[model samples]
Target: CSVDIQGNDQMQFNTNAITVDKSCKQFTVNLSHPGNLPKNVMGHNWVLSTAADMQGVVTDGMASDYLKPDDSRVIAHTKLIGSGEKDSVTFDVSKLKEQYMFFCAAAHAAAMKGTLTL
Candidate 1:
């Protein structure tokens, strides 16, 4: 099954942890923002990275957009979205060998973040 995540106007994610099935060849994350807000005001995106690299990825992405182009630190990410918007990212399960984190890099990492495990 695919993982589902939601972002709200309060800048919080619906869940704090997600577990992936390593037996699967691929995994997907569905991100939805149901709150009525503009992308410029309260945009959110799902970004995947190692737990240890979470801070570094967020830090590096701060100056740029939600995620800079060709950012190797990011394993996968959905585009920034606003109210009623939805996006998803799919990646191979082989990359789940290490501890990982999923977060929103749109300046909301402090609240919109979660742990992901294989």
Candidate 2:
């Protein structure tokens, strides 16, 4: 399943829970920024990892630019995007396992995070 999502400065997401049809060959996640904040100040990204790996992914992601290369825990990720900017990541549905999670790398996690189930 392919979907388009957006974020704003208020630390909000256009949608919370996103369901993907596993039968689909590929999944596309498009995240757009409609706010006016700069990337460093208020950036956003789309990250996909298991529920348990969420914290580590967010912690490690903060250390480097966007996501480190060859980060196995990061199933897939988009670059840190800012206002009026958009980013996306496409991966095989097989790459994603059950109990996966997604969230904004900027300011929303437990609250903004959502589940992606088959």
Candidate 3:
């Protein structure tokens, strides 16, 4: 399972829903920042976790740069990218529940967010 993701300067994601096929041995999410903002101002990342884990992951991920290094609650995630930057991640789809989520770890939670399901 592979999909393209695009984030813009408006703190918006191209999608708010993603579907995963269970037959897929592994899933891959490609992250792209197509806006003109720099990383420090409008950075974006692709983060995956259970629906129950959304708040915790987002809260911790936005705590500070110090806590952005790595976190276990994240099942999979891509690097925070700025305009013209990109990154990707591959993970086992089997590891995720029937209904999960993919969202930006930045402070723009209310708008820059989405859902994922198998």
Candidate 4:
């Protein structure tokens, strides 16, 4: 499935959850920000990890552009976007579990998270 996620001024994501098709070997996630704020103030990204690793990914993330460097908890992530910017990321479907979670790495992540299912 095609996921063109939206990050808005309200620090919210248009996509609350998704169910992807497994017919493809890989999947791509696209992110777009239509806000007027600067990246440092309203930047957003799409991060993927297992349900069990969700907390680790968020807790271990930060100190380096909102995501920890060399972190294994992150399975895939898009380049952070802000103010009319856009980004995309592709991940191997085989590497993901049946149940997964997605979220933005920015400080507003508390209200910008979702679920993913295969």
Backbone atom clashes (below 3 Å) for every candidate? 0, 0, 0, 0
Show model 4 residue runs off by greater than 4 Å.
37-40, 109-118
Model 1 agreement with the true structure over 12-96: per-residue lDDT tens digits: 6789899886678999999998776533566778899888888888777776746768888899899888779899888888766
TM-score of candidate 2 versus the correct structure, residues matched by position: 0.79
Query: lDDT per residue, candidate 4, 6-111, as tens digits?
Result: 8676666787797779786888888888766433465678888888887777777653557888778789888767678888898888886577889877754462
Worst 10 residues of 4 by lDDT: 35-44
TM-score (all chains, Cα) for each model: 0.82, 0.79, 0.78, 0.80
Off by over 4 Å in 2: 38-40, 108-118
Clashes of 1: 0
List, residue by residue over 20-78, the lDDT tens digit for candidate 3: 87789898999998767533565678888788877877666567421345677778888
RMSD of 2: 7.6
Instruction: Please identify which of the two predictions, 2 or 3, would achieve the higher TM-score against the true structure.
Output: 2
**Per-residue lDDT of candidate 2, residues 1-118 (tens digit):** 8999887766667897889986887999998887675434557788888899888777776676456567888887888887898888998887665878887666634535667998
Off by over 4 Å in 3: 38-42, 64-70, 109-118
Ranking of candidates on TM-score, top first:
1, 4, 2, 3
Best by TM-score: 1
